[PDB]
Design an enzyme around this catalytic site. Structure first.
Site, PDB file in Angstrom:
ATOM      1  N   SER A   1      -5.980  -4.919   6.475  1.00  0.00           N
ATOM      2  CA  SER A   1      -5.323  -3.690   6.953  1.00  0.00           C
ATOM      3  C   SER A   1      -4.516  -3.899   8.242  1.00  0.00           C
ATOM      4  CB  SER A   1      -6.328  -2.540   7.107  1.00  0.00           C
ATOM      5  OG  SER A   1      -6.844  -2.142   5.849  1.00  0.00           O
TER       6      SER A   1
ATOM      7  N   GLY B   1      -1.559  -4.673   9.016  1.00  0.00           N
ATOM      8  CA  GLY B   1      -0.103  -4.473   9.036  1.00  0.00           C
ATOM      9  C   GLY B   1       0.766  -4.895   7.860  1.00  0.00           C
ATOM     10  N   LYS B   2       0.551  -4.294   6.694  1.00  0.00           N
ATOM     11  CA  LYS B   2       1.401  -4.553   5.524  1.00  0.00           C
ATOM     12  C   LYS B   2       1.872  -3.278   4.830  1.00  0.00           C
ATOM     13  CE  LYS B   2      -2.978  -5.793   3.690  1.00  0.00           C
ATOM     14  NZ  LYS B   2      -3.343  -5.727   5.134  1.00  0.00           N
ATOM     15  N   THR B   3       1.151  -2.181   5.052  1.00  0.00           N
ATOM     16  CA  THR B   3       1.465  -0.904   4.410  1.00  0.00           C
ATOM     17  C   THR B   3       2.626  -0.208   5.118  1.00  0.00           C
ATOM     18  OG1 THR B   3      -0.957  -0.744   4.154  1.00  0.00           O
ATOM     19  CG2 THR B   3       0.378   1.022   3.208  1.00  0.00           C
ATOM     20  N   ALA B   4       2.342   0.396   6.277  1.00  0.00           N
ATOM     21  CA  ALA B   4       3.348   1.067   7.115  1.00  0.00           C
ATOM     22  C   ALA B   4       4.555   0.172   7.369  1.00  0.00           C
ATOM     23  CB  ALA B   4       2.730   1.528   8.428  1.00  0.00           C
TER      24      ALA B   4
ATOM     25  N   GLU C   1      -3.220   2.047  -3.832  1.00  0.00           N
ATOM     26  CA  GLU C   1      -4.570   2.505  -3.451  1.00  0.00           C
ATOM     27  C   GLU C   1      -4.539   3.809  -2.651  1.00  0.00           C
ATOM     28  OE1 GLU C   1      -6.648   1.556  -0.126  1.00  0.00           O
ATOM     29  OE2 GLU C   1      -8.535   0.937  -1.059  1.00  0.00           O
TER      30      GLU C   1
ATOM     31  N   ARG D   1       0.202  11.139   6.617  1.00  0.00           N
ATOM     32  CA  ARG D   1       0.317   9.917   7.416  1.00  0.00           C
ATOM     33  C   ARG D   1       1.768   9.513   7.712  1.00  0.00           C
ATOM     34  NH1 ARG D   1      -3.823  11.239   5.874  1.00  0.00           N
ATOM     35  NH2 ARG D   1      -5.915  10.496   6.444  1.00  0.00           N
TER      36      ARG D   1
END
Lengths: 248, 121, 245
Positions: free
Chosen positions: B31, B33-36, B59, B68
């Site tokens: 988690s 730093g790959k989503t945002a 997910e 978010r």
């Protein structure tokens, strides 16, 4: 003997039950000393909440100095030789008066007090005591009434109207704030009477601070995550202008 | 940039765009730093640099990521959001975080672990 | 042009290679709007890299700021003040002699205003606030008690420890007021600039032999990591003169 009278007086208005809800209050009521004869406490129904207002005692050279707004001049008169000390910690105050005038000049700095209780424990005779002697000289401790002050200090911060009566809560060498917690937009917390806490520890001033209740528990009151570890720091913003003492 | 805007002046100069013909890929620690990461590349290459994005969530579904992300083109999310209601002066730059993602084409797939079939359909 | 200004401002801190490393920054700095139609860009040296921080927007006020105090009683200056005794016989000698030796990075040593109230700790820095004022530099008057009350208890956080450290002239008020927990605010300020160097500013009520009955115990040899950075940036000076309260 008074509650009975009031109850039936306003029994048409005073919805029922509650006794168990206000249990803490009624129990604290009987447990304390309570009682009283410049003003007297009386109950008033304000919307859905019952408040405690002071009416001037019907029995009615310092008041050109001791002029306080949003409360009357019949009920500002109590000294220090007017002394018949019965309850404790009303005794533990004989070096927080005489030595709370000998070095409270102009920008003297340190720690005053945080008066509390319930809704009438001889508070208007100690906020009328300790102070008089300061203004008996050319020293400082301004009297002010918050639950009455703010009622239009939402809608009077306008066109010089009260704009000009409302910068002196920031600049008088000392000034007090009374029974807040009575009602309460949340701007006044940091605009009208929360503008009394930053401009008085930036130049630092020996100001008095009173309340219906105490700073150590006034930290979790208004939640009708946020203001819990966030409602504590206004009682902290409070905690530095004064040093707290009991009112049992 | 040579070049369609990648998002940053740090990221457009080096990538020279953007260009047509590119399969990119990005991966982070747990988690970390790959989503945002992408939730702000193509979104600012959807609300700031031209490209009608067909986005596809996994997910973390889309009826969650808007709680978010409404706080990028309107300065919010530290007052706080995951605590509740806001003040009538904090009701401010939300109506321009409600005018910089609404008059636009962002077309997402709420569907999680589905193979390339339904998606390339 | 902006790069030139910043370079000489922090020369003592910045190295030639630092310039070429932060080239992109310094070039982007000068290329963008130097003015504004709410903030302005200013260069700051952060470790080995030079960053660009925004400070909020005759000329004597706009190029002057203050952190956590009121601007009512700061109308002070040099020269004209009715000088009293050895309280001010040697006070307007090291704030006017050096209005061009606040060297950008060329060791321009500082002052430490201690002593007693109403006379000197913060108005001798309010003195510079309207004196170092016409030339176009900012000079932020930081106040201490008012800082660590939102920083003893916890909106954002790691933000205002850097535009307190990326502008040429500063002024701190009351050191030692109210190991420890007053850690990432004031303590670090003293350690940094042995490899950067400018004009340093701190002030209080307590002298160099009294600053330390209040910054709180540890029971140790774990607190004098920032106090051989005052003994080598001024002299043991106080102020006992005239009440202005």
């Amino acid at each position: 003997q008074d509650v009975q009278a009031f109850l039936k007086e306003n029994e048409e208005v005073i919805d029922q039950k509650m006794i168990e809800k206000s249990l803490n209050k009624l129990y604290e009521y009987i447990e304390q000393s309570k009682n009283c004869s410049g003003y007297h406490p009386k109950l008033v129904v304000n919307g859905r909440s019952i408040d405690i207002e002071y009416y001037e005692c019907p029995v009615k050279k310092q008041q050109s100095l001791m002029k306080s707004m949003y409360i009357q001049q019949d009920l500002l008169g109590a000294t220090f030789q007017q002394v018949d000390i019965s309850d404790p910690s009303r005794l533990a105050m004989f070096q927080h008066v005489t030595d709370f005038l000998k070095s409270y000049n102009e920008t003297g700095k340190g720690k005053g007090l945080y008066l509390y209780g319930k809704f009438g424990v001889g508070k208007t005779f100690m906020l009328a005591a300790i102070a008089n002697e300061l203004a008996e000289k050319e020293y400082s401790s301004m009297i002010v009434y918050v639950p009455e002050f703010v009622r239009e200090l939402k809608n009077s911060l306008q066109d010089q109207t009260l704009e000009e009566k409302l910068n002196m809560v920031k600049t008088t060498p000392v000034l007090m704030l009374d029974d807040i917690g009575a009602e309460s937009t949340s701007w006044v917390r940091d605009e009208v009477i929360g503008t009394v806490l930053q401009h008085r520890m930036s130049q630092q001033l020996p100001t008095f601070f009173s309340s219906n209740f105490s700073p150590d528990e006034l930290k979790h009151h208004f939640t009708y995550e946020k203001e819990e570890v966030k409602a504590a720091r206004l009682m902290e913003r409070i905690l530095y202008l004064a040093a707290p003492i009991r009112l049992d | 940039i040579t070049g369609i805007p990648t998002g940053f002046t740090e990221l457009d100069r080096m990538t020279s765009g953007f260009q047509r013909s590119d399969l990119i890929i990005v991966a982070a620690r747990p988690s970390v730093g790959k989503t945002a990461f992408a939730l702000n590349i193509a979104q600012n290459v959807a609300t700031k640099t031209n490209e009608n994005v067909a986005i596809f969530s996994l997910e973390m579904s889309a009826q969650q990521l808007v709680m978010r992300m409404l706080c990028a083109e309107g300065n919010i999310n530290a007052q706080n959001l995951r605590t509740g209601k806001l003040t009538p002066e904090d009701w401010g730059k939300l109506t321009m975080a409600m005018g910089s993602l609404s008059n636009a084409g962002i077309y997402i797939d709420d569907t999680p672990s589905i193979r390339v079939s339904d998606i390339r359909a």
